[PDB]
Amino acid sequence: ASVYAWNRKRISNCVADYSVLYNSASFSTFKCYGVSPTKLNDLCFTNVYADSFVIRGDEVRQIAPGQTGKIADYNYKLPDDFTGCVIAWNSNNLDSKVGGNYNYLYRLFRKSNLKPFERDISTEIYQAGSTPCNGVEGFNCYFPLQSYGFQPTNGVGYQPYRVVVLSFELLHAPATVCGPKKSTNLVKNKCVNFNFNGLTGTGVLTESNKKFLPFQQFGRDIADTTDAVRDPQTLEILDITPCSFGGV
Amino acid sequence: SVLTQPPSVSGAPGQRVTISCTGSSSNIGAGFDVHWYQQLPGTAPKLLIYGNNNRPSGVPDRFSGSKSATSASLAITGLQAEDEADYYCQSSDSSLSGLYVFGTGTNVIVL
Amino acid sequence: QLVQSGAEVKKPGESLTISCKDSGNSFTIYWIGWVRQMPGKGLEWMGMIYPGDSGTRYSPSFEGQVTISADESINTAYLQWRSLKASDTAMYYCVRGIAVDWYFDLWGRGTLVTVSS
Amino acid sequence: AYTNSFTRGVYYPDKVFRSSVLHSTQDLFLPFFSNVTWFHAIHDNPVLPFNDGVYFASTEKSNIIRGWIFGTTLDSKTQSLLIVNNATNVVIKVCEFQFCNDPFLGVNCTFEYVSFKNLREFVFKNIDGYFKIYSKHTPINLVRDLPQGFSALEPLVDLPIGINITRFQTLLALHAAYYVGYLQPRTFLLKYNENGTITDAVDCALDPLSETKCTLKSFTVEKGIYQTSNFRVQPTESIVRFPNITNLCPFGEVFNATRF
Amino acid sequence: SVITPGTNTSNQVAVLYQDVNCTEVNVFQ
Ligand SMILES: *[C@@H]1O[C@H](CO)[C@@H](O[C@@H]2O[C@H](CO)[C@@H](O)[C@H](O)[C@H]2NC(C)=O)[C@H](O)[C@H]1NC(C)=O
């Protein structure tokens, strides 16, 4: 899709293997903010957003949090607290064409900046002058959408680049996109180290009389630590008691 | 994901003939052009129409074609005896699996 | 105009290599590739290579079975077979390919390969 | 007419379990003792701005209200959220329906989903593209006005639609009054009992007594004098002063130049 | 500051503004 009308893809209710994506050497730029790429195989997230577009090869540095320029300022602005990954690879031999390709357009003129994660497909004529444009091209009334015009023979600074942005929501919620890790039978009344949906800990899992609401998942104490969990496979509630300890 | 195509048709010299190539929303949908190719018996083949509206050099003007959403068709006005050949309709697909998919093929008989 | 080799006959199990040469001075601009046609039926796409950055694309029905390479100095594409089978006898065309619009433009005369046991 | 909001419009703020704890948090809530519009249904479907969320309420005896529409223009030009519950079926639609000139019920689509004696309350909000709808139905015995008391609101559905809603409308059956209140960003101190159900809360900015309650983090304040906040006068206007010069700096003299 | 009897008795309170001549803002100076 064009950079000014980028599509958004939903990923949920499946198991994803980020190892097969990371090991590929085709990608030229691969930057993950907030999460280490090699550890994505263990965490389980609640939802994945995928965004895809094509930009100029030299100007691929602009798609990053807290950046200023043309596309970031006017077409696609990333949030300042981004927690996700950005992948960008050369696509000269797939999107460029001899004699000029005009299937891709990019916005240039707008009155105000763009809020993060907002897509605009407005086609109104820019009004750079006091006179009304009346939907007629002319003085101070230009078409806001022009094409890049990719060609195979230009330098590195003009080849098209394909960019895909993956974003996760790290909010505590019922998780549905887990990594490929096999489950293990659970043991009660013994000091074990547990991993529930990516959250790790140590302690003893015991039976509980706590009445969670059907939508209610985790319980916390004063110190923000976890106190009771619900097993994802079997809808039971387990209290977590720290292992015995003491000075000698 | 091969494209559907009727086996063969017949025609008479001096009259218009028409052929069709039909597919699905995955192959011809989402605005994907269809091109046409020839097959001379025992000869290296040659192009007919690319982009569904343009036309190359060295081809007679008696050929035309257009697409209607899911289907596409071409017409020959005034077929002659040398039109004894095989014709192919080629399109693309959404994924990189089907970058180049061809139809089964169609043939015509004069008189 | 693209030149090629002749028609050859070989035993199954050996390795056969065909080559297609382009005389033009615009080799590293467009794509090159291969196509097969089984006698009596229509053709099917095989593989396609961009020599500008050695990009290689295959078809799912012809993955691993065959291998295709190309060189930007001699300006030639090689197609090599692992193990010839009795049912792979067909007519093979080296093809020049254009981008975006995804259509072929012009091809050579091709080559004929026969395998018998 | 107008009405007293009392203590309605309180919902669970997150999915974390707490019990017997006084927890303080800032969230969009219905300010206590506010004004809600009283609409009649005799012998009335205007266009109301959305502002920052909407608390909705109804009391029902014949199921006249059957659906809701939300959006910005409501003329098939932009996507509008449309919710209908017919008998035992629920339909949520985000398709660009061509609404009738005066929609009523007798007696480019990207999303479709298919699943006075009674008082039913709703809260509608949009947070980061998440449409959150809370609801609860309860039996009451009062016809004049809203019964006084407290009832927690539980969540049922969350929808990742992403519509910038500024106007809305209900669906009345024409040949069951309802109330509309507006949410604000007010800090609240909720008292989670032993069973995890919020039974009490205080409007932290309603009056100085509530401010003291917030400062001491308790529902009971002992006799004495306490310090709770600081008063500061806010500025009224901005005054910018610069020298009165008009000459233009010759940046182009140096930034052009044939040879450097 | 908020001057208040215990809630066990009443909910009526008084408000004291510290060290300000209260011209800018039943008042006893
Ligand atoms: C150097 O020269 C260029 C023109 O070749 C100047 O660019 C013009 O600047 C004026 C004043 O801002 C604009 O009205 C024109 O539209 C600009 N034209 C172009 C080509 O952009 C440039 O300002 C000069 N040096 C500086 C100060 O950057």
Side-chain angles (χ1 to χ4, degrees), chain A residues 93-98 101 152, chain C residues 31 50 53 57 99-102:
Chain A
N93 56 77
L94 270 193
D95 285 14
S96 85
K97 180 186 178 188
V98 58
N101 183 25
Chain C
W31 290 69
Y50 200 65
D53 35 15
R57 299 315 218 92
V100 197
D101 271 292
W102 294 130

Side-chain angles (χ1 to χ4, degrees), chain C residues 62-84:
Chain C
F62 277 69
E63 200 142 20
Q65 292 223 10
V66 301
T67 295
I68 303 97
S69 60
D71 266 8
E72 63 177 354
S73 324
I74 167 180
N75 320 338
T76 308
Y78 304 170
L79 184 150
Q80 53 188 346
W81 278 76
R82 303 300 70 51
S83 46
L84 279 77

Side-chain angles (χ1 to χ4, degrees), chain D residues 251-253 255-256:
Chain D
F251 270 136
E253 175 58 29
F255 270 97
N256 286 172

Side-chain angles (χ1 to χ4, degrees), chain A residues 36-96:
Chain A
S36 97
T38 188
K39 212 168 295 142
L40 285 165
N41 220 321
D42 284 354
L43 278 274
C44 180
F45 323 94
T46 179
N47 215 10
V48 181
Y49 299 146
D51 311 322
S52 42
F53 42 88
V54 48
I55 53 172
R56 282 238 303 259
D58 180 75
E59 198 222 327
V60 80
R61 46 165 281 294
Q62 194 184 104
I63 170 73
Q67 290 302 307
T68 43
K70 186 56 226 186
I71 325 190
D73 214 342
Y74 271 45
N75 305 337
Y76 189 90
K77 172 69 74 67
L78 272 186
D80 217 333
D81 54 356
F82 194 22
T83 162
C85 293
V86 168
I87 316 168
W89 70 86
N90 192 294
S91 69
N92 199 356
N93 56 77
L94 270 193
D95 285 14
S96 85

Side-chain angles (χ1 to χ4, degrees), chain D:
Chain D
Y2 284 20
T3 322
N4 272 278
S5 309
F6 290 111
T7 54
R8 300 289 187 177
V10 152
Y11 58 95
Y12 291 80
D14 40 3
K15 295 267 174 161
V16 183
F17 181 84
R18 300 184 181 86
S19 64
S20 40
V21 162
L22 281 53
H23 188 300
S24 87
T25 173
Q26 54 279 63
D27 204 326
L28 307 178
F29 269 110
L30 182 46
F32 275 12
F33 297 95
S34 68
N35 277 344
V36 295
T37 313
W38 162 260
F39 285 129
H40 65 312
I42 61 173
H43 295 294
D44 54 297
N45 271 342
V47 182
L48 305 322
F50 194 75
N51 296 339
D52 298 322
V54 162
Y55 165 81
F56 185 98
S58 300
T59 188
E60 284 282 352
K61 60 185 181 181
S62 58
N63 197 25
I64 285 301
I65 292 166
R66 225 75 71 80
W68 304 259
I69 83 165
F70 316 120
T72 307
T73 59
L74 282 42
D75 53 356
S76 196
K77 191 147 188 302
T78 192
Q79 299 92 50
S80 177
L81 171 64
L82 192 173
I83 296 168
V84 188
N85 54 304
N86 41 355
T88 60
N89 169 243
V90 183
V91 176
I92 313 306
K93 162 172 151 291
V94 198
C95 319
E96 299 192 0
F97 203 101
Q98 182 72 74
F99 301 149
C100 297
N101 295 346
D102 197 5
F104 102 93
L105 182 62
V107 177
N108 291 27
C109 171
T110 68
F111 199 163
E112 170 163 1
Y113 154 70
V114 177
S115 171
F116 293 112
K117 299 302 184 181
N118 251 14
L119 166 66
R120 180 181 39 230
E121 300 183 325
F122 300 62
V123 173
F124 284 63
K125 59 182 187 179
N126 271 110
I127 296 171
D128 291 332
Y130 252 124
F131 191 90
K132 290 292 307 161
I133 161 176
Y134 303 78
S135 155
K136 184 82 179 70
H137 99 291
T138 186
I140 68 165
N141 297 286
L142 186 62
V143 68
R144 185 174 65 245
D145 215 338
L146 177 72
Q148 185 175 1
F150 207 10
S151 181
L153 269 206
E154 54 91 31
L156 290 176
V157 189
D158 59 281
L159 296 180
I161 313 203
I163 296 180
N164 170 34
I165 304 166
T166 54
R167 288 83 160 159
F168 33 100
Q169 197 233 7
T170 184
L171 297 178
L172 305 173
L174 312 183
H175 292 280
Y178 72 98
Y179 314 84
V180 175
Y182 293 9
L183 308 176
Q184 288 179 7
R186 288 264 194 91
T187 306
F188 273 65
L189 183 120
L190 316 93
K191 169 186 174 184
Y192 294 82
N193 61 0
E194 84 282 1
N195 280 8
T197 296
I198 38 175
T199 65
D200 256 344
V202 297
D203 199 338
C204 198
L206 174 58
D207 38 24
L209 185 59
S210 300
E211 274 267 355
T212 301
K213 282 178 179 178
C214 280
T215 280
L216 299 185
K217 300 285 198 298
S218 183
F219 267 38
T220 41
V221 281
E222 294 211 327
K223 182 154 166 273
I225 168 171
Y226 305 87
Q227 180 137 54
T228 189
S229 193
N230 327 297
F231 164 67
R232 147 190 293 280
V233 179
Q234 261 197 314
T236 85
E237 63 178 305
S238 63
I239 302 300
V240 178
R241 297 277 264 179
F242 281 146
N244 54 347
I245 45 145
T246 56
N247 300 31
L248 263 66
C249 299
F251 270 136
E253 175 58 29
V254 73
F255 270 97
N256 286 172
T258 61
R259 63 153 62 81
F260 273 35

Side-chain angles (χ1 to χ4, degrees), chain B residues 4-104:
Chain B
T4 74
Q5 193 169 1
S8 81
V9 294
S10 186
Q15 66 111 12
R16 186 203 41 70
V17 78
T18 310
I19 212 68
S20 68
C21 183
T22 73
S24 66
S25 64
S26 85
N27 47 76
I28 204 170
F32 275 122
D33 268 296
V34 286
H35 324 277
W36 288 89
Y37 301 88
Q38 279 51 63
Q39 197 59 50
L40 268 298
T43 311
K46 188 162 41 72
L47 188 145
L48 167 62
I49 169 155
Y50 72 113
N52 206 211
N53 229 27
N54 305 356
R55 39 182 293 109
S57 182
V59 56
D61 194 73
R62 40 200 205 183
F63 290 108
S64 65
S66 294
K67 58 168 140 192
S68 295
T70 53
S71 176
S73 195
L74 79 95
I76 310 165
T77 89
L79 57 99
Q80 190 168 12
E82 74 266 11
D83 288 328
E84 290 306 316
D86 219 38
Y87 320 84
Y88 289 151
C89 57
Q90 165 258 325
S91 170
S92 61
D93 194 74
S94 301
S95 176
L96 270 300
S97 169
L99 256 195
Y100 273 141
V101 285
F102 287 73
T104 62

